[PDB]
Amino acid sequence: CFHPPYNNFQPDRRAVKRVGVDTGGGTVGLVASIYRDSKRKIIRDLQKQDIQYVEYGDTRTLIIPTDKYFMFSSPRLNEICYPGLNNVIRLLNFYPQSTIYVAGFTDNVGSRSHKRKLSQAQAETMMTFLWANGIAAKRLKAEGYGDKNAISDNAIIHGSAQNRRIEIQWFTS
Amino acid sequence: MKFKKPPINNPSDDATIKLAEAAVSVSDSMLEMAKVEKVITPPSKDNTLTIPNAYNLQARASVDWSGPIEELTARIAKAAHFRFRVLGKSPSVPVLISISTKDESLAEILRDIDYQAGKKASIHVYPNSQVVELRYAKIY
Amino acid sequence: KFKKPPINNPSDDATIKLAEAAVSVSDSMLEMAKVEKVITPPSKDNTLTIPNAYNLQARASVDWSGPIEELTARIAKAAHFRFRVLGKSPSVPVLISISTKDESLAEILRDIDYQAGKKASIHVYPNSQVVELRYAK
Amino acid sequence: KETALSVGAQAGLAWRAKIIDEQLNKQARNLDAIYDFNSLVLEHNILPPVLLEGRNTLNLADAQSIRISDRTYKVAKQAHFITTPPTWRQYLWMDYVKPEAPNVTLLPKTKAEKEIWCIYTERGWKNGIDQANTILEENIARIKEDFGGMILYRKLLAMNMVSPPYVSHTDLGVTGDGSEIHIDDRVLRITALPELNVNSAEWRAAVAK
Amino acid sequence: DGCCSKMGGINYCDSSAGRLVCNNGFYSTCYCTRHAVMDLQFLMGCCLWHGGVYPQLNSSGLVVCNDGYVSEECSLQK
Amino acid sequence: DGCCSKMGGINYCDSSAGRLVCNNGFYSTCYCTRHAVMDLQFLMGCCLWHGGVYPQLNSSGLVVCNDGYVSEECSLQK
Amino acid sequence: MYVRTNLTILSPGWLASMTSADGTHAYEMQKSPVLLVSWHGKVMQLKVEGL
Amino acid sequence: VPKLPCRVDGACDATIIKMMTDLNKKGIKVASVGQNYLISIPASALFADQSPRLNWASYSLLNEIAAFLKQFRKIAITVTSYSSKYVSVKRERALTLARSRVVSEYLWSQGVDSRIIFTQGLGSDKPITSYTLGGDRSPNARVEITFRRAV
Amino acid sequence: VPKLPCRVDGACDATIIKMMTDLNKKGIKVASVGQNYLISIPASALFADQSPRLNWASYSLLNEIAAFLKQFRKIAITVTSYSSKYVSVKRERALTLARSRVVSEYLWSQGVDSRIIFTQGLGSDKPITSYTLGGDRSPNARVEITFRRAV
């Protein structure tokens, strides 16, 4: 049926499951499947998850909370919030030609070299997972920055919480 | 069509907030102090030379110890099948070690233990002799 | 099916910041110990080596706290070795306290020398079965 | 009335103290990990002293009279011996005692008395909360100050602007009468206390890369 | 009441910021601790900008501030 | 409350072990003397990490520890 | 206060300590209703009453 | 409570959400990331074609955005103007500068609680899309305001 | 006395016996002597075909075994791995080492209060049965946990 650990890197077959369980109707199964695979529904699902999506003209960006989709203070990943990653792959399938930039970001506290190394490691892990999902290697660039340029204050608790993040940018042409 | 910033954690506590706020400053100050002293004092030798690694020292270990030294080193020697040897006598004041690590190498664990012990004790190894020597410091 | 998360995981902002600070202070203190620590190379560690003589492989148990002369002479008597000195004893004798339940003569002598330190040394001639104490000048 | 105020204040203070102590117990290991003291003790089991530094001070004595200073240094606590490294319990742990005293005889009579009792208890609860938080703030400030003084002394000793302490040790052989004997008398006394050097040539600067 | 309306509601009070945090990922507009920046620009309390109100009790209705200045307007009339 | 429940039953309390013995030769869960190994973290009372509570009482409700430190949280407040 | 054990007292700070030939420790220190011992690498507290 | 303020004057998160939704339905872009807010307005709906003039209807939208921005506490706000490529470089540079000047002047006239206002124009130097068939109707021609909600 | 704990928290002898019986009847080997306890688990019910990637369904078994482990006040725990001869010696030695590392990491993540955990894997260097026909199905290829109860 399905494997929670990334379905062994195989493309999802969920529409067949739904149409089968609905026939067991075909029409309602098909309409529900197309409704859920509609990009609007995927965006709503991502919004339901703790994941941010920004669209500006053609350039489009994704924001990921490291603490929620990562293992604490380590290049490992959480193995519970994998539905978000599956949705990420499903969405990214829609733009199979645009190049991708990905970056990692931490807070201010710590050694400069330490923070830069950790950011680079996390970004590299993310891009490696994306490539292993099936994306062409020539369309990826990865980078890890420390506190070089934050998006909020590092002198307050929730601000520092928002500071550490994963950023994804992609064009269209 | 609601809006939401990503980070949503469990509710926090004011005491924890204050503790972390103190801790960051303390860590930064001590970090720059360490940088300054490293700059002013040149490093010469590495304890790896004194205690090199060898075969069968690779079985991994995850530890959490906050007591004296002898029990820990005896357990390590028992695991490593190496002969424990002691030189010198411990002073009246015990030498206390606190270690919070996980899943690393035996050789580096022992080197870190020696580093934390510092100028009170030292650890030596003889692989051909498969012995671990724990020497105290003769002082005062 | 169920892979439970870490139990005492830092699921709070203050907790994660505190843990990161703990990592930082650990690293900094480790560096401090590294830089301030002083070691001697194993090439020039002037300590007595194991004589590896067959007559020194026995086991015993001795708890002595006093001069070195009587203890070393008795050890030589047990090992069937002649024993002599070189130098002169000071006014206040050198005091050594070693206790063991099971130990061999080689490491016993090595520990004796290590306790003695700069004040005295011990040499072993296995070709001519003798042990010589050497005072400092 | 004010009796309800006082008992509610007591209840709130006790509850907050219990909560904060429980939180401190739960988050323990990292605390001792960061607040080491053994890695700070000196050579002879001598606790390093405590120092304070001030920057850019000013005092207007009166009209016509002003005195400014760039930097100043104070020896807060003189160094002294020690047998066991300090921990954080004697700086942050709170006294907890459940007040089970039913010293209440102004029992409610009407709804108005019941609700004024309720509001008095509420403000007492809040007052206990703020009291506990203030005590915690003072404690954490004090322990931070002590640790800062320790690290300041370490830094300045590294910079070679203060005199390191000096201890002299003497040794004596067997001693005692025919009924009491000691094997090895070893007497150690700190002859030279730590202090600063008001000299100038002895100053070596530091610059990183 | 609940300032975090039209959102998830109150999550917790950031004491360092002195602000409530809504369940929605945003900072609330209300407060929880007095140590916050509110642009207060008017207040009462006479003998102001001086030694304050002298704690002495006097037979006369005039009140003198601790700096020696007197606030007759704060005091009674005749 | 059965310490050796679903077992051989209570055999005896070893004081040197500070533990109960089940009839089947497996160490029990309960304790039987204060001279045992219990994980102790939470404590009651006040003037902790000090000279304890001073036995002498004062007319004022303040309580001061025997090392000279005063515990406001232990003293009742105005 | 005098105490006799084989553990390692930590918190209050003992004024004097004596060691037997079998690792038994006898400590002498100032009065305090609580003790702290690192037993086997694990921190532990000891309750003292009747002071 | 009667003395200590409990809320910042004229604050209502419900109103904030309402007007954010209304603005985005009107099509003017509102974006928030961390402690930062960026609002983008198309040039066609505000200014005259290739000229710095103001339609009388536009002042309703200006009043709306002023009332919105009045809700927050800030330090500095930055305004940038972008347009298409029409004749030269200095042409649209000056046009953007004048448009930013006018909008900043009106906003400052409005009782905006702000300390610093910065105004800049660039023209058609960093367009958001390669497709540039439209002129002032092209979406790249726009005005942007950026600021940070401070504490 | 009244507030002093009656027993060690999170411990019930009936629960211990019940879950030990459950594990033994499910086939996971539990052995007791004095106060030294040993547990054996066939590698087939844990890993893939000679791969250091634990099967997803085995997480319930790991949860159960950790839940059993939580009732014992312990100091040191040893986890070792045995395998079959597949290609070389170093291959399966590294495989066993990785498997032991992973299981040790998961246990350390779980709340099993110890002081020391040792982990190692020695491939097929400690055979216990002449039958070596199967591969990962062979009984000797397995994992084992040893510890000694304290006090």
CA B66 vs CA B69, D38, D124: distances in Å: 9, 12, 41
D-chain CB neighbours of B93 within 8 Å are: 45, 83-84
C95–D34 C-beta distance less than 8 A:
no
* DSSP output for B8-27: ------HHHHHHHHHHHHHH
Contact partners for chain I, using 3 or more CB pairs closer than 8 A, are: A, B, C, F, G
Q: What share of chain C is helix, strand, coil (3-state, %, to 5)?
A: 40, 20, 40
The rounded distance, in Å, linking the Cα atoms of B100 and C19 is: 12
G-chain CB neighbours of D28 within 8 Å are: 43
Write the CB contacts of E25 (distance below 8 Å, at least 6 apart in sequence). Answer: A162, B4, B5, B6, B7, B8
List phi, psi (to 5°) of A146.
-90, -120
D39–C32 C-beta distance less than 8 A:
yes
Q: Beginning with the edge strand found earlier in the chain, give each strand of the sheet holding A59-64 in spatial order.
A: A52-56, A59-64, A165-170, A100-105, A140-145
The residue of chain F nearest to residue D19, with distances taken between CA atoms, is F42
Is the four-CA dihedral A101, A102, A107, A113 of positive or negative sign? negative
Q: Which of I56, I59, I110 sits opposite C7 (nearest CB)?
A: I110
H-chain CB neighbours of A173 within 8 Å are: 130
- From first CA to last CA, the distance across chain B in angstroms is 75
Distance from CA of E17 to the nearest CA of H (A): 7
Kindly give the pairing relationship between strand H76-82 and strand H116-123: parallel
Q: Which of E3, E40, E43 sits opposite H13 (nearest CB)?
A: E3
**Mapping DSSP to helix (H, G, I), strand (E, B) and coil, where does residue E33 land?**
coil
D183–C97 C-beta distance less than 8 A:
yes
The rounded distance, in Å, linking the Cα atoms of I13 and F7 is: 8
**Mapping DSSP to helix (H, G, I), strand (E, B) and coil, where does residue H124 land?**
coil
Is the four-CA dihedral F14, F17, F18, F19 of positive or negative sign? negative
Nearest C-alpha neighbor of I81 from the set I133, I36, I146: I146
F40–G45 C-beta distance less than 8 A:
yes
The rounded distance, in Å, linking the Cα atoms of H130 and H126 is: 10
C-chain CB neighbours of I109 within 8 Å are: 6-7
The rounded distance, in Å, linking the Cα atoms of D80 and D52 is: 17
Q: Identify each DSSP E strand in E1-78 by its residue range.
A: 10-14, 19-22
**Eight-state DSSP code of residue H7:** B
B60–I119 C-beta distance less than 8 A:
yes
I60–C1 C-beta distance less than 8 A:
yes
H-chain CB neighbours of B5 within 8 Å are: 32-34
Q: Say which residue the tokens 């399966």 belong to.
A: I92
Q: Which of C15, C26, C97 sits opposite D27 (nearest CB)?
A: C15
The rounded distance, in Å, linking the Cα atoms of I17 and C97 is: 52
CA angle (A84 as vertex; A80, A88 as ends), nearest 5: 140
Kindly give the pairing relationship between strand B121-126 and strand B131-136: antiparallel
G11–F40 C-beta distance less than 8 A:
no
Nearest C-alpha neighbor of D81 from the set B116, B92, A126: B92
Kindly give the pairing relationship between strand B83-87 and strand B131-136: parallel
Q: Say which residue the tokens 């290590």 belong to.
A: C114
Nearest C-alpha neighbor of F48 from the set D87, I19, I145, I143: D87
I59–C1 C-beta distance less than 8 A:
yes
Are the C-beta atoms of H81 and H143 separated by less than 8 Å? Answer: yes
Distance from CA of I97 to the nearest CA of A (A): 19
G-chain CB neighbours of B67 within 8 Å are: 8, 38-42
The rounded distance, in Å, linking the Cα atoms of C51 and D95 is: 62
Are the C-beta atoms of A87 and A42 separated by less than 8 Å? Answer: yes
* DSSP output for H93-114: HHHHHHHHHHHHHHHHHTT---
B-chain CB neighbours of C21 within 8 Å are: 20, 23-24, 26-27
Q: What share of chain E is helix, strand, coil (3-state, %, to 5)?
A: 0, 20, 80
Distance from CA of E11 to the nearest CA of B (A): 6
Structural tokens at position C26? 């650990």
Are the C-beta atoms of C37 and C30 separated by less than 8 Å? Answer: no
Contact partners for chain F, using 3 or more CB pairs closer than 8 A, are: D, G, I
CA angle (B107 as vertex; B101, B111 as ends), nearest 5: 70
The residue of chain A nearest to residue C23, with distances taken between CA atoms, is A110
- From first CA to last CA, the distance across chain G in angstroms is 9
Counting other chains too, the contacts that A132-140 makes at CB distance below 8 Å and 24 or more residues apart are: A132/A9, A133/A6, A133/A9, A133/A89, A134/A9, A134/A89, A135/A92, A135/A100, A139/A98, A139/A99, A139/A100, A140/A99, A140/A100, A140/A102
Q: Region of B118 please: left (phi>0), alpha (psi -120 to 50) or beta.
A: left
**Eight-state DSSP code of residue F65:** B
D21–F42 C-beta distance less than 8 A:
yes
> Of chain A residues 100-159, which have a CB less than 8 A from chain E?
156-158
